[PDB]
Write a protein that binds this ligand. Structure first.
Ligand code: MG
Ligand code: MG
Ligand code: MG
Ligand code: MG
Ligand code: MG
Ligand code: MG
Lengths: 147, 145, 145, 147, 145, 147, 143
RNA sequence: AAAAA
RNA sequence: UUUUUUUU
RNA sequence: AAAAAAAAA
RNA sequence: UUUUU
RNA sequence: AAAAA
RNA sequence: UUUUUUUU
RNA sequence: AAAAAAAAA
RNA sequence: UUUUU
RNA sequence: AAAAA
RNA sequence: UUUUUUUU
RNA sequence: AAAAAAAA
RNA sequence: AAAAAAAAA
RNA sequence: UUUUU
RNA sequence: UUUUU
């Protein structure tokens, strides 16, 4: 009910409201994972909790979607690619959502969305997905909900 | 999307990212107040791991609300005053709210105009607090950056 | 209410009160200016019992207007210049107004944008004033708090 | 004619306007008065003029309405009450606008409005109204016009 | 006015003039950045005869955009980070933009809100810059005054 | 696409745009020229380029219109007047746009507009117009385009 | 585009190397105290007005302004008595200034039938004033 | 969105 | 668009 | 059946 | 609606 | 845009 | 406008 | 078929 | 639309 | 506001 | 809504 | 002769 | 018959 | 919009 | 409408 103005204005507050000193937070976390040739890597959920993301105070998180980009150049004569295999505590998926680059100098991107019925919390000991690529590193952007 | 399995996302280029973004918050905390003496509420109280804000170093306050946290002296009704402070020049307003029931908290608050919403660091103060009660609860609405 | 007697007011709870509120004002005062020398108008001139503002210690200026208070030198028309000053960084504008009649005051003024309307204390200055006249009258629109 | 913007803008001022270094002020003054049992107290207008209200520069004021709240607890076994008898230099009123509390822990409130035909100036030597109450103190909020 | 000759102007009184007005500008310049070290971009870079702004002493920044000026290290894609700084309190945001092609610049930028658009002098800094490239080009939109 | 808000917001910038470190500037330059009795004075364009106008970095300018005001009192018993004769490198005009004051205490003003077909650049060695007046000084306000 | 084009002209048109010209001529005349000054039409034919090639002119209106200050304690005034070759008039169109520092202005319009040509020897109107140098602006048609 | 009047 | 020179 | 803010409904 | 820019 | 109810 | 004194 | 901003479409 | 004032 | 195509 | 498995 | 060719 | 500000109408 | 109709 | 974000 208050805007404009150039000086302080009195607020007619009432009863003490419902408060929460540690609220939730919807985020997209950008971090990188190194990857080997012909070998899959399980991305740990623990990478999401860090002071570099203002999330070191959380212990759980609900992932919503994962997106992966190749972070380094591919091998000689090759185009970049990156695969994603979703992992769940109730049962690992066998999908391999793959995306390849059409220009050797361009990143390779791919992503997958977690359905509502599978959006449960994950802790640092859990894994998000498996990453396969010919590039030595892969950049990730995970849309999740810390709680 | 009413679906029961993972579906592929056809991502394109790498987007603009930010690992340490801003945050609009309402921070609840308490301060001890002595009788007849004004207590300067420090900005550093907003930065704390108890509020997930220990990674921030500056904050832009939007409004300050106060509630008496303990019972008033005998035969008296609760009251609480707020005097906004600013690094460009402290104000002399004394926004006061009194309780109509001896068992009920006293409440008052003020809004900072847009032209006075600059950052404040831990060494700064937001306002002075006066009350006949020994503790005052505050719920400060601010934007951490 | 077209009534000729006192009528009862059915008051309820005690409302939020403020004994020392803010005040939007237009303060008229004069300053002495020497020829070829810029005079820094101090903010402390706004705080005075002559303006009912001796209880304030900070003020947020919105606009500054100036008028030459005395006659210009012989054969010359009056003029007056204003250079806004700010604690974050003084500006170099010289808003100038000249008189088209030797018997008429010269006038000019500037507006401070919203993003530059922060408090100023008595030790601060608002702007520099230049004129061929010995005195300049100012009517500063500000918000005392 | 000027708003928005991010820098100073030139104002094309004209003739020297009509000025007033000491303007009027409409206010609501909150102050307290102690009260005795079974004894009325005449509230002096002089309480309105003080540096605590930024009004020490005034010598006259035009009261518009008076509102009174009990400031301390009532006697044991009793509910709080407060009366108001308007006072005027042209003739004191005999009204006793009373308000009682329905909860022993709650304030008692009452007020009265001065009609336009009786809104003349009052100085420090004058009185506003008489206050009667069983509570040792009474809080007042007077809507007036200093001039 | 589709006319081919000079036409008379029926001027009246002398208008309000300003020989040193303000100026909204987009200043392009470059800075050298070392690997793993944040470079504080000084405000004094905006004041230069190369930008016709050597007559100004203060400036109000509105937005900052950055582009990597040189090629990234071998096997790496370009990136650039920006951390806005303010005299009232430095922020901790790290707005980052990465290039999807090793031969393409990385770009990112941030906007300063109205409540944080105060003047900055040459001794001040606008933001920190991090990048794997050795140089970063910036196009700062500001208002010289 | 960005306004309101109270904190910094990320801009999703793209390719490096087209830049210009030394852009043009439309200005109205106020400066004074002394004038003699019965003698014309050629106003040099070089007066427009100065650090007092933030224009010392320019070497050319396209004048659009000229306006002249008398700056000092006229001779005794006389009303003020001021004439303007436009000057052009392709051919000086013979017009004498004159304006006289109807009150001895009032300035005398006159101006002229340069047509689009004659709006070419002028350098410091060039002249704008000739000024004639009975007042010892004349004030000018030239609407031009520095480039 | 922004360059020349060709005009497909036809037969040689009707020409006139010395056409007419409507003008408003400003000039001043010296006036004595209590004496009426006859303004000669020849003052309109001058190289200072690009009119030294004309020998006749058709006057439409006359407007007068005092050019110098009035005597001490007096307000400026100026009178205009129209003159015509077919018969001098007796009107004294007078204008007075409500400010001692302000010019006194007056004028008169010539009707459309009394607008015949006048040569340099002819006079246009008498001028009276307490100021010494009344200025004139005459709207006329040179031919 | 010809010029003087 | 009151007139005159230029102007489809 | 014209643009706002500050104190008092 | 009062009143102060 | 009478007062008490 | 439920009523009573005042009130065109 | 009511007033905004911050992070995630 | 989610969610934090 | 099923999934692959 | 082009098709196939699931799906009133 | 009443549409097209080069530049915008 | 799309969102603003700065200097010049 | 230049050239050609 | 010119022009600078
Ligand atoms: Mg790759
Ligand atoms: Mg590509
Ligand atoms: Mg009580
Ligand atoms: Mg109660
Ligand atoms: Mg003059
Ligand atoms: Mg005048």
């Amino acid at each position: 009910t208050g805007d404009n103005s150039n000086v302080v204005t009195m607020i007619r507050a009432g009863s003490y409201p419902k408060v929460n000193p540690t609220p939730t937070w919807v985020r997209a976390i950008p971090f990188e994972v190194s990857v080997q040739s012909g070998i899959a890597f399980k991305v740990p959920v623990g990478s999401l909790f860090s002071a570099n993301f203002r999330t070191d105070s959380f212990t759980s998180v609900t992932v919503m979607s994962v997106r992966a980009w190749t972070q380094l150049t591919p091998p000689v004569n090759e185009y970049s690619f990156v695969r994603l295999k979703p992992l769940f505590k109730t049962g690992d998926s066998t999908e391999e959502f793959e995306g390849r680059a059409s220009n050797i100098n361009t990143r390779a991107s791919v992503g997958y969305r977690i359905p509502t019925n599978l959006r449960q919390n994950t802790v640092a000991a859990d894994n998000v997905c498996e990453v396969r690529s010919n590039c030595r590193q892969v950049a990730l952007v995970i849309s999740c909900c810390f709680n």
